[PDB]
Amino acid sequence: PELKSSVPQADSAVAAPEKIQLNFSENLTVKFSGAKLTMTGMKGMSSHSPMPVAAKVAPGADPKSMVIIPREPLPAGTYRVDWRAVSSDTHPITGNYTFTVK
Amino acid sequence: HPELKSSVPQADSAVAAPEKIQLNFSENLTVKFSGAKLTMTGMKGMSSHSPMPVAAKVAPGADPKSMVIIPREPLPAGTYRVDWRAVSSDTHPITGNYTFTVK
């Protein structure tokens, strides 16, 4: 299980996304996978108070992907995506990346 | 920087469901920059590969060197992991984690 790509792309600066797409190299065992979203920075906020962002995860149209749908608006700021992917091998793989909302 | 001196439930202990989780540190906490999360990593009847986040709220302790985690849901018998973030006046985050079981 390896992350092939993501939308938003890592280290990118884009308009608030309607959803976050994570595309992996193998078919996901979604019941054992997951992801979380955190707002690590925002104008007017301290640099030491990261805010978790409520979100829901759903299986993608492509079985090698999953999508994160935020349950709250995404203010301009910096975000971190933490993910956990598991395939038929049943061996958890984790990773993370950051992107900015402008 | 703050160091975890003790906790209730204690690390690697088996206890009756706690009403709250108390984290005691060596230095006064800057609670606004601190925090913690609770995850149910195991439960009889559930898969071994599907950790479940447990909603909770964090409040400052009576003792300025402590903070309390109050779960927003019941805690069924099972295994739990506490992840914490503690910051003192030095303003440097220190993180750690420990596990305990509810029986």
Count of CB atoms within 10 A of residue A100's CB? 14
A9, A13, A19, A24 alpha-carbon torsion, rounded to 10°: 10
User: For chain A, how big is the Rg over CA atoms in Å?
Assistant: 14
Angle at B81 between CA B78 and CA B82, to 5 degrees: 135
In whole angstroms, give the CA distance from residue A53 to residue A38: 5
Contact B24, B7 (CB under 8 A): yes
Which residue in this structure is represented by tokens 């920075």?
A: A41
Residue B64 is assigned to a ligand binding site: no
Distance from C-alpha of B98 to C-alpha of B11, rounded to nearest angstrom: 6
Query: Smallest Cβ distance to A46: which of B33, B47, B49?
Result: B33
B33: contact with A, CB 8 A cutoff:
yes
For residues A78, A84, A85 and A86, what is the CA-based torsion angle, rounded to 10 degrees?
-170
Q: How far off is chain A from B48, nearest CA to CA, in Å? A: 9
Strands (E) located in A15-92: 20-24, 34-41, 51-53, 55-59, 65-70, 77-85
Contact A55, A18 (CB under 8 A): no
Written in H, E and C, the secondary structure of B31-51 is HHHCEEEEEEEECCCCCCCCC
A66 is in an annotated binding site: no
**Which residues contact residue B35 at a Cβ distance below 8 angstroms, ignoring those fewer than 6 apart?**
B58, B84, B85
Distance of CA A65 to the CA centre of its chain: 11
The whole domain housing B37 covers 1-103
- Best mutation target among B49, B54, B81, B87 (most A Cβ atoms within 10 Å) is B49
Q: Are A48 and A10 in contact (CB under 8 A)?
A: no
Q: How many domains does chain A have?
A: 1
Contact A61, A84 (CB under 8 A): no
> Which tokens is B100 given?
């305990």
Hey, how many other C-beta atoms are within 10 angstroms of the C-beta on B3? Answer: 11
**Which residue, chain included where needed, has tokens 């790509």?**
A5
Tell me how close the Cα of B9 comes to any Cα of chain A, in angstroms: 25
CB A66 within 8 A of CB A55: no
Q: In whole angstroms, give the CA distance from residue B54 to residue A48.
A: 23
Q: CATH no. for residue A21? A: 2.60.40.1220
Closest CA of chain B from A79, distance in Å = 17
Burial of B87 by CB count in 10 Å (0-12 exposed, 13-18 middle, 19+ buried)?
Answer: buried
Within 41-100 of A, beta carbons closer than 8 Å to B belong to: 46, 48-49, 86, 90, 92
User: Which residues share a beta bridge with B15?
Assistant: B102
Strands, sheet with A51-53, edge to edge from the N-terminal-most edge strand: A13-14, A93-101, A77-85, A34-41, A51-53
With b for 16 or more beta-carbon neighbours within 10 A and e for fewer, the A81-90 pattern comes to bebbbbbeee
Cis ω on the peptide bond leading into residue B18 (within 30° of 0)? no
- Assess contact for B101 and B43: CB atoms under 8 A: no
* Maximum distance among all Cα pairs of chain A, rounded to whole angstroms: 45
